Write an enzyme that holds these catalytic residues in place. Structure first.
Site, PDB file in Angstrom:
ATOM      1  N   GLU A 263       0.911  -1.143   0.000  1.00 30.14           N
ATOM      2  CA  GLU A 263       0.000   0.000   0.000  1.00 30.14           C
ATOM      3  C   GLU A 263       0.970   1.217   0.000  1.00 30.14           C
ATOM      4  O   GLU A 263       1.916   1.289   0.818  1.00 30.14           O
ATOM      5  CB  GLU A 263      -0.814  -0.006   1.272  1.00 30.14           C
ATOM      6  CG  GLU A 263      -1.894   0.997   1.127  1.00 30.14           C
ATOM      7  CD  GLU A 263      -2.975   0.499   0.172  1.00 30.14           C
ATOM      8  OE1 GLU A 263      -3.150  -0.711  -0.148  1.00 30.14           O
ATOM      9  OE2 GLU A 263      -3.607   1.380  -0.351  1.00 30.14           O
TER      10      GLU A 263
ATOM     11  N   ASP B 279      -4.471  11.074   8.692  1.00 31.67           N
ATOM     12  CA  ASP B 279      -3.239  10.477   9.183  1.00 31.67           C
ATOM     13  C   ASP B 279      -2.754  11.070  10.468  1.00 31.67           C
ATOM     14  O   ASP B 279      -2.791  12.308  10.622  1.00 31.67           O
ATOM     15  CB  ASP B 279      -2.126  10.727   8.156  1.00 31.67           C
ATOM     16  CG  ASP B 279      -2.220   9.713   6.993  1.00 31.67           C
ATOM     17  OD1 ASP B 279      -2.044   8.459   7.301  1.00 31.67           O
ATOM     18  OD2 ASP B 279      -2.517  10.066   5.846  1.00 31.67           O
TER      19      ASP B 279
ATOM     20  N   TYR C 173     -10.949  -2.730   3.215  1.00 29.20           N
ATOM     21  CA  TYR C 173     -10.080  -2.261   4.292  1.00 29.20           C
ATOM     22  C   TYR C 173     -10.861  -2.296   5.594  1.00 29.20           C
ATOM     23  O   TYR C 173     -11.819  -1.512   5.778  1.00 29.20           O
ATOM     24  CB  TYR C 173      -9.633  -0.809   4.009  1.00 29.20           C
ATOM     25  CG  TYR C 173      -8.454  -0.362   4.882  1.00 29.20           C
ATOM     26  CD1 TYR C 173      -8.660  -0.091   6.232  1.00 29.20           C
ATOM     27  CD2 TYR C 173      -7.209  -0.194   4.355  1.00 29.20           C
ATOM     28  CE1 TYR C 173      -7.635   0.325   7.087  1.00 29.20           C
ATOM     29  CE2 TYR C 173      -6.160   0.264   5.264  1.00 29.20           C
ATOM     30  CZ  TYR C 173      -6.419   0.499   6.580  1.00 29.20           C
ATOM     31  OH  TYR C 173      -5.420   0.899   7.489  1.00 29.20           O
TER      32      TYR C 173
HETATM   33  O1  IAD Z   1      -0.197   0.384  10.711  1.00 29.64           O
HETATM   34  C1  IAD Z   1      -1.432   0.162  10.351  1.00 29.64           C
HETATM   35  O2  IAD Z   1      -2.308  -0.452  11.155  1.00 29.64           O
HETATM   36  C2  IAD Z   1      -1.891   0.573   8.938  1.00 29.64           C
HETATM   37  C3  IAD Z   1      -2.441   2.040   9.000  1.00 29.64           C
HETATM   38  N1  IAD Z   1      -2.102   2.740   7.755  1.00 29.64           N
HETATM   39  C4  IAD Z   1      -2.532   2.295   6.495  1.00 29.64           C
HETATM   40  O3  IAD Z   1      -3.270   1.335   6.372  1.00 29.64           O
HETATM   41  C5  IAD Z   1      -2.089   3.126   5.294  1.00 29.64           C
HETATM   42  C6  IAD Z   1      -2.705   4.523   5.394  1.00 29.64           C
HETATM   43  C7  IAD Z   1      -2.003   5.744   5.336  1.00 29.64           C
HETATM   44  N2  IAD Z   1      -2.957   6.754   5.441  1.00 29.64           N
HETATM   45  C8  IAD Z   1      -4.220   6.187   5.530  1.00 29.64           C
HETATM   46  C9  IAD Z   1      -5.492   6.762   5.612  1.00 29.64           C
HETATM   47  C10 IAD Z   1      -6.609   5.948   5.634  1.00 29.64           C
HETATM   48  C11 IAD Z   1      -6.461   4.570   5.571  1.00 29.64           C
HETATM   49  C12 IAD Z   1      -5.211   3.971   5.472  1.00 29.64           C
HETATM   50  C13 IAD Z   1      -4.089   4.799   5.472  1.00 29.64           C
HETATM   51  C14 IAD Z   1      -1.800   2.840  10.130  1.00 29.64           C
HETATM   52  O4  IAD Z   1      -0.669   3.527   9.887  1.00 29.64           O
HETATM   53  O5  IAD Z   1      -2.388   2.894  11.252  1.00 29.64           O
END
Ligand code: IAD
Ligand code: IAD
Ligand code: PLP
Ligand code: PLP
Ligand code: NA
Ligand code: NA
Lengths: 394, 268, 394, 268
Positions: free
Chosen positions: D49, D60, D175
């Site tokens: 991803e 984020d 997801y």
């Molecule tokens: O480490 C995880 O659990 C995966 C998660 N990140 C992702 O799945 C990729 C991601 C980056 N930004 C986003 C925004 C929404 C969904 C997914 C993402 C996180 O950093 O908590």
């Protein structure tokens, strides 16, 4: 010889050099004429409504009084154009000056608010305004000085004497002694020689008139007491006037106690000064034992007039109004309390009145009482002062 | 006593006007001020007008504002001024001495007490700058109970009622104001005063001394020609002090020269 | 699926992460319920009247228009408690939050006014308020930050991205994504995801409702045009809403032209940006060619929202409202002009609207026209900025 | 193409879960990012991803906020990301590649054009973080016209209507969100997800990959045991980058160790 009595009991009078008496008599005659002139009254009412924003709100403060039997309202002069009650009477005096055919305004100021008010009224009404301000006060009120200038007024520092408000009061009178045929002296409080104490009360009495209508509307009865800070006496006599004949209503005036009365560093001449003659009137004054005039001290820069209006000294002598004082720390605590619990930042002047109402409440929390505090102005201007003090603490 | 009456009688017998300088007591210090005052007398002053330093002299222009400031810089108090006055009288038994006061200093510890102190030190008159005739009653009454002449200012546009009151209420001399505004040496008076002067005589007012802007000998002779009994010069005298602070000796010489010339202008 | 349409033509929508959709749908349902609930309406009206000081004055400015055939009135939102129109809608949103049972408020702010407003409403109404503010803006808005704190709010600097308003907008949404069950996001303009553009207009529409009644009272007809500055769009849609169906009334929105449109340093996305999707909505945005969001530039710190409410983009597209821009120097000249000629110090935001009305007047001085400018706030806060610029000149 | 379907089929034949790391393209620079990505694959990543740096990543947490900031510090643009993607696909023909986008970057110059570029470089799916199912139509339609799977997030409290829509609209994988809030490695998910997982299977949704807070091998094996097809770890991977910026070599070794352990947890 005058049309109206220049005295309130022993206090007041017209103690000016002979050359200024005609200016006073002319002003008194014009004022008496204006008060009977419906066109003047309609013009003043129109500016107060559509320019200044009258009537102002009367706000109940239930968060502050929770758990006690005090109900407290604040008369919101902080919402008046300019941010303080002084705007009411400068509009009235500007109209008087125009009625007399004058094109120029002279005004004194300490903390700057009266200068700003007189400059705005002058700008709106086509008058050429010059302001005297002690140089020590110019230095510490840079914001207000620039507001006056943006509004077209001339600001003239005064370096004589102590270079603060009393010295600017002297300078305004000196100038007027020579220019009264073209200039009106727009005095900033309910003090000085007759007819000013009378004119300034009458051009502020809408505060108490509106408060009376508003409290009857909301509570169906008059307040147990109305409470107002006393620098020179205008906001307080504006609140008190319409209630003077309502004998059940207590009138409480609050002078600045500064660092505490016993320290001598305060601004409470009415209760802790000595009657003298200065600035055109007989009234209690801050003065040395030999009779030299001294400054008032307060954390609040606008409670700096070193005397008090003669009508207050009179209402105190006959026991119709009571006067107390509040210290810098009490005023600061009230300022903090209103910000946090009502989302209103009050002028530190006005915080002296609120502080006394809070003591009335907290001293006797189960006494049933309905109080109005005149919130004479907003405290945006005091944010830095308060910040720096609290920083000196944490 | 009868000091002004005696003076005016004497000068009239000589067809001469009075020349009366003003200074602030204690400017620039007590000892120098006493020397200044003896110099003014030796140089020809016919009477003296003396200011007690006050915090807020709202009828004075900058020159006299500054005299008051210098005197306060020297720590001068009203009690010290009264000690000065006593010594000046002890040196000079006949010259009339008038004080220029602000009201608070007279009312401060009792109006009657202030006039009684004036009589004790041998002062002849008191002009209270911020007491108009309308407020003068307790002042004039106390003055007269203590053999002090209360002096009133007659503004140059005074109406008839005011003239009559000034005539009736004042004693010693009538202060004939040259112009509106506040004390100052620079601004000369543009008003014909012959009429006020005649009306004052008509009402048997105390003799007129012209003051405000009196800074040159020609104004002294002009006041006398207009019918005034004399003239008072203050800011011009005080500027001589202000200009010579660094040389006390030159200060006294320039005061001597100026007073001599002013008094010479008053002689027949 | 929603109760109300989330779009104005092509603009608006609900572009938030799926986890926030329930928060939006809950807020929309609560808002629709509140708008039909007479007790909610009476409670909001009571705070707006007795706490905020509504109705505000409508002031005619004859000194400014002398010698021309323009008559100009200013709607005086500068007299509202807090000094700017933002107070209307934060009171409404605080009541919505309480209706939904929430005890906490999240808000973003740029220049600080929205933070102050949300802190005052929170203090009055018993809500725990936390505010996000880009660290560059914290540094330059020390006064507002301290006001927020004196009013009990928590102020949290945001150091991500450009450390200004958009980054604080992001941070508010991040926080809400995790805390919506207890916190309401008190968004500061008529933008963001539905239902905010709709709620914020409805909780500001009293500005135009009062303006309509006031101008009919005083002039007997509707304005030829109502003019308002556009940062994010709330004061302008508040003024325009009640006139949208009055087809003869021109609606003019004024975006900040900054140093001039051709320089690229401006804040006028509606007329000079490019439609994008960000902050929960589709609308014109300040953005690079590749689609990165950029800051708006203005001498006025409060016209900093880098996009514009979707209802404005829609009213522009169908040609019911017109949008123009005014440069820093034009806004400054209007600020000076109002101070000197009417004794009113306007916010530099609002000075953009006044400046455009002054051009309408001066460009065509014999055109008969009746104009209202929404004076969205007071300019006490701008005194130093204006001073320092004029000092750089003399 | 059918990359995810092929993957999931293969893993099911091995009773194995998918382990899918996330990184931001171009963090901390393009060359290092390409090395990071090859290391993730060599260490056992089943799919990738990949984030395109965006100015305002409002879903984020700080870890990924900072990845975006580092990438912008290196001047990384979306066009450069598309060049990277092409090269990664040229090196690795079967591994599924999903992008994590914000809407503005997709809509910017035309939604259909963005999906056509994804198909040209050989991307398999796109998750647009700020497009909920309610706004997804033009996105899912363009994705499917260009053989790109549109991916949707299923919140842990999703109601039935939402589950059905996510099932109907998504392709490739679903997801499965561990918790509310924003990406971050530290906050672990307190919600039983077995129910959402079963309901997703019931509605023939794309296989579920659990994400948010996935930071340790035990969470990988737990997701698989709960019925998910695998798990995605991003913030935990990105923190390895952030911690090792000064030593690119140690950065790759620690990434290798972490991915290896995470992937080992997914094996039968
Ligand atoms: O480490 C995880 O659990 C995966 C998660 N990140 C992702 O799945 C990729 C991601 C980056 N930004 C986003 C925004 C929404 C969904 C997914 C993402 C996180 O950093 O908590
Ligand atoms: O020089 C003069 O003309 C005399 C006049 N001064 C006085 O007569 C003494 C004086 C000092 N302060 C006052 C106030 C009122 C009257 C007189 C005086 C002046 O300085 O202009
Ligand atoms: C000037 C001022 C005062 C003091 O003057 P008063 O004449 O005693 O009313 C009090 N409050 C505010 C806000 C002021 O501006
Ligand atoms: C916030 C503010 C604005 C800009 O915001 P809008 O949502 O466009 O109204 C304009 N004027 C003042 C005084 C403000 O405080
Ligand atoms: Na006082
Ligand atoms: Na904008």
């Amino acid at each position: 010889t005058t049309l109206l009595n220049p005295y309130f009991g022993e206090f007041g009078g017209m103690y000016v050099p002979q050359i200024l008496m005609p200016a006073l008599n002319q002003l008194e005659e014009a004022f008496v004429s204006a008060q009977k002139d419906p066109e003047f009254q309609a013009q003043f009412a129109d500016l107060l409504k559509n320019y200044a924003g009258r009537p102002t709100a009367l706000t109940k403060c239930q968060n502050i009084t929770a758990g006690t039997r005090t109900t407290l309202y604040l008369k919101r002069e902080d919402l008046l154009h300019g941010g303080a009650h002084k705007t009411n009477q400068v509009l009235g005096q500007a109209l008087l000056a125009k009625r007399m055919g004058k094109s120029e305004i002279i005004a004194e100021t300490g903390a700057g608010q009266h200068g700003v008010a007189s400059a705005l009224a002058s700008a709106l009404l086509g008058l050429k305004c010059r302001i005297y301000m002690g140089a020590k006060d110019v230095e510490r009120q840079s914001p207000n000085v620039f507001r006056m200038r943006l509004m077209g007024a001339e600001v003239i520092p005064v370096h004589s004497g102590s270079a603060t408000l009393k010295d600017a009061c002297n300078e305004a009178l000196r100038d007027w002694s020579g220019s009264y045929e073209t200039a009106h002296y727009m005095l900033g409080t309910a003090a000085g020689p007759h007819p000013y104490p009378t004119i300034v009360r009458e051009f502020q009495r809408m505060i108490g008139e509106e408060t009376k209508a508003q409290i009857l509307d909301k509570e169906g009865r008059l307040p147990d007491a109305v409470i107002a800070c006393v620098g020179g006496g205008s906001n307080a006599i504006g609140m008190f006037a319409d209630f003077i004949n309502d004998t059940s209503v207590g009138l409480i005036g609050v002078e600045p106690g500064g660092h505490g009365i016993e320290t001598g560093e305060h601004g409470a001449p009415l209760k802790h000064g000595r009657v003298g003659i200065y600035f055109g009137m007989k009234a209690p004054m801050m003065q040395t034992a030999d009779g030299q005039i001294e400054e008032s001290y307060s954390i609040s820069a606008g409670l700096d007039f070193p005397s008090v209006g003669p009508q207050h000294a009179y209402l105190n002598s006959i026991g119709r109004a009571d006067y107390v004082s509040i210290t810098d720390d009490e005023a600061l605590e009230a300022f903090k309390t209103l910000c946090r619990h009502e989302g209103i930042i009050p002028a530190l002047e006005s915080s002296h009145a609120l502080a006394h109402a809070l003591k009335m409440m907290r001293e006797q929390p189960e006494k049933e009482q309905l109080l109005v505090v005149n919130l004479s102005g907003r405290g945006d201007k005091d944010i830095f002062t308060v910040h720096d003090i609290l920083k000196a603490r944490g | 006593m009868e000091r002004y009456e005696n003076l005016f009688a004497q000068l009239n017998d000589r067809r001469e006007g009075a020349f009366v300088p003003f200074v602030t007591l204690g400017d620039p210090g007590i000892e120098q001020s006493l020397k200044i005052i003896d110099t003014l007398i030796d140089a020809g002053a016919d009477a003296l007008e003396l200011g007690v330093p006050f915090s807020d002299p709202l009828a004075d222009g900058p020159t006299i504002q500054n005299a008051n400031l210098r005197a306060f810089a020297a720590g001068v108090t009203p009690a010290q001024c009264f000690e000065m006055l006593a010594l000046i009288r002890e040196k000079h038994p006949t010259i009339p001495i008038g004080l220029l006061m602000y009201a608070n200093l007279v009312f401060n510890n009792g109006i009657d007490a202030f006039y009684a102190r004036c009589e004790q030190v041998g002062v002849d008159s008191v002009l209270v700058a911020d007491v108009p005739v309308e407020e003068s009653a307790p002042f004039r009454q106390a003055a007269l109970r203590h053999n002090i002449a209360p002096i009133f200012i007659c503004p140059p546009n005074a109406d008839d009622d005011l003239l009559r009151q000034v005539a009736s209420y004042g004693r010693g001399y009538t202060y004939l104001l040259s112009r509106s505004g506040v004390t100052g040496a620079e601004n000369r008076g543009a008003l014909p005063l012959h009429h006020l002067i005649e009306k004052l005589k008509e009402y048997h007012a105390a003799p007129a001394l012209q003051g405000f802007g009196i800074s040159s000998p020609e104004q002294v002779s002009a006041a006398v020609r207009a019918g005034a009994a004399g003239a008072i010069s203050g800011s011009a005298i005080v500027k001589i002090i202000e200009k010579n602070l660094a040389s006390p000796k030159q200060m006294l010489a320039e005061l001597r020269s100026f007073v001599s010339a002013m008094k010479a202008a008053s002689r027949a």
